[PDB]
Structures are given as C-alpha cells and as structure tokens.
Amino acid sequence: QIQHIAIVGCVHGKYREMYRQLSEYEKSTGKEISFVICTGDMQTLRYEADLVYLKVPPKYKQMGDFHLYYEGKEKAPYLTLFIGGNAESSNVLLHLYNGGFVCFNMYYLGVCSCININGLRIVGVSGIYKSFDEKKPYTYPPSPNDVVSLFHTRNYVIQMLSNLSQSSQIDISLSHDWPQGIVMKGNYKQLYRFQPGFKKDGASLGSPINKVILNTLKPKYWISGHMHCEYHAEEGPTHFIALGKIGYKNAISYLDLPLKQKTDLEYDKDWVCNLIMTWPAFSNKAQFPDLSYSISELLSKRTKELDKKIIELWEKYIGLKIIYDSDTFDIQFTSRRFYIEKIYNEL
Ligand SMILES: [Fe+2]
Ligand SMILES: [Zn+2]
C-alpha cells in the first residue's frame, strides 16, 4: 500500500505546464499521484490589479496561468498543497495567513501550519528570510507599500511550530529558501559546478529560521526550492530535497511513501490548539502578531484535557475536514478569525 506524492519546486505562474507534466507522468508510469506539494513562488494573481503585490523585476511582471484556475476555466487535476515564496500575490496570501483555498484543489498552508493527509503530518513555512524584517508584524488590510516585506519570513513562526514534534513525528516539512547550513551536508562540490555563485555564500546560505525549525521539528523529509536547481542533502535523518523551477525538468520529483490509510485533507490537531491558544497575540486585526505577548509561553497553557475540548469546538464551528470555500479572501480572513476568537472565548 504505497502513495505517490508529487513534489514541485518553483511554479512562477506556469500552472498549465506543471499539471501537463504531472498528467504525463501518471499516465507514463501508470502510478497514481495522491497529491501535489509546491515549495512557493506560485504567483496566485486573480486579476490585473494583483500585479501590484508581485515583487519581481519588470521583465517578470506577468499574470501567469493562475487566473485561469481562479476564473474556473481551468481545473487543477490534483489536490495541490503549497506555501508562499518571494514571487507571490502577497495581498492574497495575507488574507489567507491562516490558510485557505485560493481555488479548487489549491490549498495555501498559511504563514505556517501543519495539516493531515493520508496519515501524514505536513508542516509548511512560507517566505524567504531577511534579517531586518524577521521581527516585523503584519499590517492588515494589505497595502501596496508592503510589497517588499510581506513575503519575508517572521521570527515568531519558530515558536508557533516548536511543539509540533512532541506528540508524534513530522513526516514532511516545507520551506521556500533552504535551511541555513544544509548546503554543507550534501555534494556541494557538484552543486558548485551547477552554480559557482552559491560558493560565495558558502555555509551561510539559506534561512536561519528554517535551520532552527529543521533541527527542532525532526522531520523525515524537508523539501525546498527558490534556488532553481536540484540538490539532495542529509542532516541526521532529514532527506533534504531541493527542486528547480517549472520549465526545466528538474523541478518535479516524487516521494514514494507508505500509505497507512487514504484520509482526506484535515487540520492538524496540535496545530489547531496552537492556533487557538495564541489568539491574544493575534486579536488586533490591524497588526499581528502582538509580540508583547510571549508566543512560546502562551502555548505553555496547553493541557491534555483543554486540548481535547478545543477540538470539539473546532469540529463544531469549523470542522476537522479542510473543505473548499469560494468566499472572497477578505471574507475568509474575517470568518476564520471569528471562529478562532469564539473558540478561545469559550474556554
Ligand atoms: Fe523564490
Ligand atoms: Zn523561484
């Protein structure tokens, strides 16, 4: 009983090319793709006005294929879970910072979260690291002035995810830029022959935020992109897999993993409790998170019997199944926070 998971690097708005390759493979090899995982740079632009939030050089200010899927004239043939990179419709991803479907079969994991599917636990970390913005809060609603800073990974995601490895093991973890120092743990002399530019950065290459998360959350696999190249490294058990950009046939690999039980996409219980217990830090919708609160010790108020009754209210008001919701992304922002607040205020 085996599931075939398609892992994809940078998409850069070339969705039809990606699904064309995925559809070719499963009818090539006869294998069936369970779901697809993307490592960011999705460019989920709905309409021309969203081009303002895409931080790219002028030669890449393009719509891409996503608007066809948002308009419904194209349909993603596989369930696609993805995180955010640096070339994103940052306004859209800020509305869905708690996750959400940008269209049918395309689920955004949020700023960071953990999900359940087919007995696996999958963690995502969006954005790329820039030191001068790691402690900077988000401002809502999204403004065109924040195009340069919205896609930067915030430091607080380290404390939002640190406890996820306590109850069980993390199977797959996602980041866009590489975990800092992971370049030192594979065939780097061959990688430097691909790009001698990476030799300048050396061991300091990558995100230090993802390095802390990688060493803490223990995962079996860590898949990243951003670098537009293939690379595999090993640090402890973690099979590090870097993928390239769509258009080059080094972007899509496949994880042939054991299938415990075919199970629908669901919210991770431990993450749901972390999300509720941290609501005081996110209570101000205009600016979050309020780092005057301690995210690490807000989570210390979790107990076994309190966790199990957060789940009941979540299953009542939201549901354990992650289902498609076609409401506008600004409405989904208010709705998800509305029930997060309601669940918290009932404990
Ligand atoms: Fe990137
Ligand atoms: Zn890229």
From Swiss-Prot:
Entry binding sites for RNA: K55, N86, A87, K130, H152, G197, D201, H226, M227, H228
Molecular functions (GO terms): iron ion binding; manganese ion binding; RNA binding; RNA lariat debranching enzyme activity; zinc ion binding
Transmembrane segments: none
InterPro entries listed in its UniProt record: Calcineurin-like_PHP_ApaH, Dbr1_CTD, Dbr1_N, Metallo-depent_PP-like
Zinc recorded as keyword: yes
Keyword field: Cytoplasm, Hydrolase, Iron, Manganese, Metal-binding, mRNA processing, RNA-binding, Zinc
Binding-site list for a divalent metal cation 1: C10, H12, H228
Region of interest (Lariat recognition loop), ranges: 126-154
Xref: Pfam families: Dbr1_C (PF20890), Metallophos (PF00149)
The organism's place on the tree of life at top rank: Eukaryota
Cofactor(s) required, per the database record: Fe(2+); Zn(2+); Mn(2+)
Signal peptide: none
Regulation: Active in presence of diverse metals including Fe(2+), Zn(2+) and Mn(2+). Binds two metal cations in two adjacent alpha and beta metal-binding pockets. The activity is the highest with Fe(2+) bound to the 2 metal-binding sites. The activity is slightly lower with Fe(2+) bound to the beta site and Zn(2+) to the alpha site and decreases further when only Zn(2+) is bound. No activity with Mn(2+). However, another study showed activity with Mn(2+) bound to the beta site and Zn(2+) to the alpha site. Mn(2+) appears unable to bind to the alpha site.
Binding site for a divalent metal cation 2: D41, N86, H176, H226
EC number, UniProt record: 3.1.4.-
Subcellular location: Cytoplasm, Perinuclear region
Coiled coil (residue ranges): none
GO biological process: mRNA splicing, via spliceosome; RNA splicing, via transesterification reactions
Gene Ontology cellular component annotations, sorted alphabetically: nucleus; perinuclear region of cytoplasm
Family: Belongs to the lariat debranching enzyme family.
Name of the molecule in the record: Lariat debranching enzyme
Record organism: Entamoeba histolytica (strain ATCC 30459 / HM-1:IMSS / ABRM)
Gene expressing this chain: DBR1
